[PDB]
Amino acid sequence: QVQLVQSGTEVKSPGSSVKVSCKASGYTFTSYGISWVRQAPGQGLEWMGGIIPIFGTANYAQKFQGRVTITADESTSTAYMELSSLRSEDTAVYYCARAPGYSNAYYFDYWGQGTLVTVSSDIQMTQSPSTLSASIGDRVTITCRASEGIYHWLAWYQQKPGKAPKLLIYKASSLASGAPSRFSGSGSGTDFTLTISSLQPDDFATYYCQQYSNYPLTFGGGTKLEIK
């Protein structure tokens, strides 16, 4: 009964600013963090930053050069993301997500529905294959490779078209609450794999890996799993 309800679509002109809200319910707000991740074709999933409200500590991706401000109101269980001097390339779907930890360097167990915002050195994560066709009942294995050692600080997500990502695996091999047991994660260091035993019809989706070893938090390009 954890919910993250985001505000509506934002239609913007370049140079302007946008403030997005994320209303949380069903849990103790101060016990967790709220992060922001945007998604657009071409850049894929990109981390903006996060806030740990109880500590009032915020971390942002350096790329944004201070243009992003993340705040939180514990009185109303609401987090905000403000993005200044808007560019054409900031056009994306912006998600808020719960970081079930005490740090902004984490994985996200619950995601909001997303907010469309229209305008007008790091650890590289490489996923393979990019697309995969398979049949119901098959064993499928997906790879993720980090440009440097990340120990076991890797998470896997499932994303259905136009929906919020869903956490499947964290700590490289731990199964997320409510994720099907046919999903398993393996790896340590630089090479990781997600395996689905007995592919079900509900498993056709896009799969992403994410490191949370250090900042900036980075994601793979995704593996689209298709039928036949």
147: domain CATH number? Answer: 2.60.40.10
Residues 99, 60 share a domain: yes
Residues 89, 156 share a domain: no
Q: Is residue 228 part of a domain?
A: no
Domain-ending residue, one of 120, 146, 180: 120
Q: Containing domain of residue 23, as a range?
A: 1-120
Q: DSSP assignment, residue 176? A: P
- Number of compact structural domains in the chain: 2
Resolution in A: 2.2
Residues 163, 95 share a domain: no
Q: What is the DSSP string of the chain?
A: --EEEEPPPEEE-TT--EEEEEEEESS-GGGSEEEEEEEETTTEEEEEEEEETTTTEEEE-GGGTT-EEEEEEGGGTEEEEEE-S--GGG-EEEEEEEE-SSSSSS--SEE---EEEEE-----EEEE-SEEEE-TT--EEEEEEESS--TT-EEEEEE-TTS--EEEEETTTEEPTT--TTEEEEEETTEEEEEESS--GGG-SEEEEEE-SSSSPEE---EEEEE-
Residues 142, 100 share a domain: no
Residues 92, 150 share a domain: no
Q: How far apart are CA 66 and CA 51, in angstroms?
A: 14
Q: How far apart are CA 179 and CA 73, in angstroms?
A: 30
Residues 137, 96 share a domain: no
